[PDB]
Symmetry: D2
Subunit: 404 residues, 4 copies
């Protein structure tokens, strides 16, 4: 019976160790992700009622850990110490696959269970949830591993039972760890906002098709008989999108109207803007082989693309957005929005139901998680540096923890 076990090792099934290895960010090393992370020994948090301790086999890589490593737009360690927190470190990571190792009171999962996690927490007793709100939209919702300490970049992780989903048996630990953040988010975007869900025959414009969200979105649209049109910044990435089932792709480099909308009273500026948007639209028609608009636009690029997305969406269509990679000003030409009765929908993460459904589709082989590269535990910094520099490969990445 030991305080600390090496990675790959653990106390007897059913028992939590006092301490563990984890990858820590500290304020004194805020900056370039490559130098922000270091493996250290820390105390394992307590397992409360309704919680489990997971032996983490692999963990996913995420934009949010880049933010954490930089200390912007927020000093996570300081923001957390105000809440009354004692730790002067941050353990990130918001996707994982692993094995349930110990269980708290009231839990139905048993030690040995293979799980993947949806890295969202909420208060199941919240007033809004009680009166019918989807938990992920609760005032009490927060992102596990980013808005809270003790994420998945750790030998063991305490998770609430409701966060857990059955690991698809066909997947490696890395592949199972890499997908939930992007796949479940894309699934909620495309199928979570009635009555604007992808139907057979629907063209769907997918920004960043070769990226994490986009790679899952293309497969989902194809799977339901929709017509996925991907946007990319290289032929190589376009080819990846074709392999995933895209109808075709549009090279964003061939346009230069990207960015905020001019004042709608600036007639010359609007005419210039419209020229670019219409050129993009004609290219969309070309890829589609017909003069039709996308019924749904899968957004996340944000400021650069939102005006085009709004223009492109069909009458009674939806632009659904879960981020703003290029900036947070989403400039809408209200005329397109109201006259054609379009929906601009914000979306974030997924419900437990959605996490379970996308997991089912992945398990049955309808959808591939698109694992592109696997890192060792000592390479967490390198992995996030790649994302920081926009040099990460297409698809999703993973880090080995206890898995070999």
């Amino acid at each position: 019976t030991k305080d600390l076990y090496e990675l790959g090792d653990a106390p007897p099934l059913g028992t939590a160790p006092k301490q563990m290895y984890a990858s820590l960010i500290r304020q004194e090393r805020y900056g370039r992700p490559v130098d922000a992370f270091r493996t250290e020994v820390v105390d394992v948090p307590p397992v409360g009622p309704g919680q489990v301790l997971v032996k983490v086999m692999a963990a996913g890589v995420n934009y949010n850990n880049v933010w954490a490593a930089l200390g912007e737009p927020l000093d996570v360690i300081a923001a957390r110490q105000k809440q009354g927190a004692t730790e002067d470190f941050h353990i990130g990571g918001s996707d994982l696959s692993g094995i349930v190792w110990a269980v708290g009171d009231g839990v139905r999962l048993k030690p040995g269970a293979e799980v993947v996690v949806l890295a969202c927490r909420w208060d199941e007793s919240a007033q809004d949830i009680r009166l019918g709100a989807d938990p992920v939209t609760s005032s009490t919702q927060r992102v596990w591993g980013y808005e809270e300490n003790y994420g998945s970049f750790a030998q063991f992780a305490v998770v609430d039972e409701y966060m857990c989903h059955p690991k698809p048996q066909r997947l490696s630990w890395a592949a199972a760890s890499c997908y939930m953040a992007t796949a479940a988010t894309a699934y909620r975007q495309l199928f979570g906002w009635e009555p604007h869900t992808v139907r057979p025959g629907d063209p769907v414009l997918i920004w960043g098709g070769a990226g994490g969200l986009g790679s899952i979105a293309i497969q989902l649209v194809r799977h339901v008989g929709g017509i996925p049109v991907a946007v990319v910044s290289s032929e190589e990435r376009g080819e990846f999108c074709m392999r995933l089932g895209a109808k075709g792709w549009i090279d964003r480099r061939e346009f230069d109207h990207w960015g905020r909308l001019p004042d709608t009273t600036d007639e010359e500026a609007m005419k210039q803007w419209l020229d670019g948007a219409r050129a993009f639209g004609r290219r969309f028609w070309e890829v589609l082989g017909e003069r039709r608009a996308p019924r749904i636009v899968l957004e996340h690029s944000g400021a650069d693309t939102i005006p085009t997305s709004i223009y492109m969406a069909d009458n009674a269509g939806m632009v659904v957005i879960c981020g703003g990679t290029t900036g947070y000003n989403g400039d809408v030409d209200l005329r397109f929005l109201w006259m054609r009765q379009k929906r601009l929908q914000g979306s974030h993460a997924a419900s437990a139901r959605e996490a379970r459904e996308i997991t089912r589709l992945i398990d049955q082989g309808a959808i591939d998680p698109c694992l592109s590269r696997t890192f060792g535990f000592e390479e967490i910094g390198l992995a996030h540096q790649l994302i920081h520099d926009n040099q990460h490969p297409s698809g999703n990445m993973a880090v080995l923890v206890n898995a070999t």
Copy 2:
């Protein structure tokens, strides 16, 4: 049997006259609405299958006729002559009450029927409608009396049967003519976009509460047990909103952050903006008597207010907008939109179902059309000049045609 009948007079019931009085805009008098309209004699258009000729008793006043009179943002007469049209005049008007006077083939309405109109046309055989689209959202939808010639500022008007709704018997001709454009639009905004419809207990932020849309919206929100908070620009208008059932009102003059959003990277500008939005939010809490956000925001003011509306809406809430009085740049802070999963919904006019439902509520006395002033046929110019100058009274206005 005469070619032309004076206002108030008509051929025998069942028979269309060859000619009629109508209020005409001509290009040579484009400009100030007060001088744009003149009564002239014109040929009555043919009544085709599925159409009826209505003896117009009263007609509603509308922003769109101001646009028509100005010749901006479009020369309606020229835009229409390109389509191949022969007329060198425009007869506006997009709300009416009247009596069915003659019927085309296949029509179920009989002469004598008292009707009010939803001034929207669409092709009932349209591809999109056939595949399930709500007709008002069709690629084939257009506004009768504005996007088409021969509106309701005329002794008789040809309308398609599907545009017709039973006139509430309790209303004067003026009151029955004044309401459809605003009341049905507000009804679609508040009850037409599942799952974001007003429920008992929901706070609803209503811009322009004393205006046409707002006056109906406050009553509708109150009627279903929601909590209407009105925005106004005077105490007198606030008092009107209270009489309509508002919980309270906010004076927009007390804030100065109105307008487009700064670049989200401009930290000083954003902090200034947020200070104003939060001040507005605290005032909202005060009127409500509790720290809660509006679940639905009824928009139409547009550029000045949209950033505040987006900020204000509750998690999983909706900002629904049908115009842009102050401008067409709707600037969204994507962070508020996606992180709290908010919906920004464009809406326009109403479906026939919605027109019929709001008519039912008005008929049964649940909702008052808010007729504020009635004009004579020779005062159509004056009436629209008032709107042009923003000197029109609260509520909705009407013009007498054949009614005395």
Copy 3:
């Protein structure tokens, strides 16, 4: 500091007493409700986390307590002792108004809060709820006060916080206690099953219009601009329905085709049945003043009426049922159901959201709880005997507990 307080009295606010008065059913007095209940002193159950102790001011009367008193179709005390329960008595009651007197850990309500209860419990951690089920439909749902011991026929009652709703201030304790079981159930029936919810202009057939459910249903249908047609068994009861806003009423005594459906191959029997159903339908047309079918049928009478309800419902309409007063065989002629694409929907109780919404409408005066008679605590037996004998008055009844 005393073990036991007389009705109307209590320990200091914030403190639970060791014992209390309650109205008990015991197996040795199973039978006629009038002799089944007796006031006794019992131990007050513990208040756990998330629970509160309510000082019960008044309690509602309910069919279910008749079942309990009879010992059919279930010996509640025996069924409960198998679960491992120790008590040899049953304290019924499934509606109450009262004052929060003591609170468990984690509760947001404070002592002094005036509440009414939705008498449904469920496990907020249930698997089905976690994956998106409405809690009232959970595998874990059960009726508080009937399927569990220690209901509201008691000086104090332990309730879970999620069961609580704010007592409308305008109502007496009796009126506030009498409504939730029927009003929230009717509200879920009529507004809870999208897309089949009552819209302005919809005719709605309401069985038992003068009864508990029906009295609320008529008001709700009228309130939203629907057209309520009530079924009754006397002119006096018809007149009550008119006062509540019914368009008119149908006397069920004038028909004799009630009951199970004949074999659909029995042509003479079907022709006889259809003759009665069509006669009922023509009477419906008469009350309505037009040849239209009800879009929604509010059911609960069950076996006698279901075949007629199914026949009557409009194309794409709904028959929604929450009980089977006359029997549990609901015989459907599948031809009417499939050819006209009708919905037969089972419904039970309400969600917390629905309980809160109907409470809001009652609070604002849109809906009256229809309190018909108030009893003293020693008359609980008499009150339920009335229901047993079908001699109870129209509307809803209540029993005073601590209220005077």
Copy 4:
């Protein structure tokens, strides 16, 4: 230019012939389908506005033509002559693939277009449709080729443009003609009744899995990641269901509680019935590998199975039914229905949107039409005799018309 062309031949593209070959039922040969049909020459009906004349390449086989051939439950020729019809024959057939040969006024399709038909007509100007009804549910809806004369058992057929859908290019004429009636109906059953549509992970009980509806249903359920459990009457048919993607199958011959429900007060009869239903339920659990209920039950067998279907459906689940092969008494135990809040939904045919969507899935290869046998034009009688005698093969059948 000839009056009459042999099968396989036609006038020049764009031109309708005066006469055509067709397969006729006449009253004097009502009875066994094998002797009810005879090829004769008839006049081709006129092509009106919005209509097209299709050169029929192949036609589907259908239960409804058996009814027609028998003259029960209706003498179609007599029922139609009362409407004022002149013909003393009936040309059946309600599925077809073919080539548009001539077009009426206003039509967008061009001669040469390859189409399959949804054999439903409605009035696009109907009051109910105008106020929002799905056309297939209209008071004006009827089945083309059965409720109307001049179906697809004819060299040419007049169809309304809205009935037409693009023929999947990969399919033979026979395969394209065989699927719409069953595939679109099953698609509406499973995906047409929000919020009860098949989701990934949902078990679905499918009666008649090897049949027309069932064969499509199994594929659809599998495709969306649901778990299809088929009911069959032979091992051979079970094996077919496995090939289509079923999780497993249940042999209905192993149970004998099938049929109408006993009176719910008959305790011995109910206990016997429940024993059979529970045995069926345990077998369902076995096939599934877990103790779960089907969320959706795909019904059509009717009287024999409905009580079991209602018992089997999960809490808040749906039994959706489009026929009653075994009889029209659908006996519901209201206790299961209301206490567990289950939906019993009638469904018929499909909307145009649904026909187009299932066609898209078939075109893309997600779904196979399951063509089991193709007949010559002179074998229409034989084909329907097979169905009459329940000796037809699994899947769907077709008849060649102009195709070779």
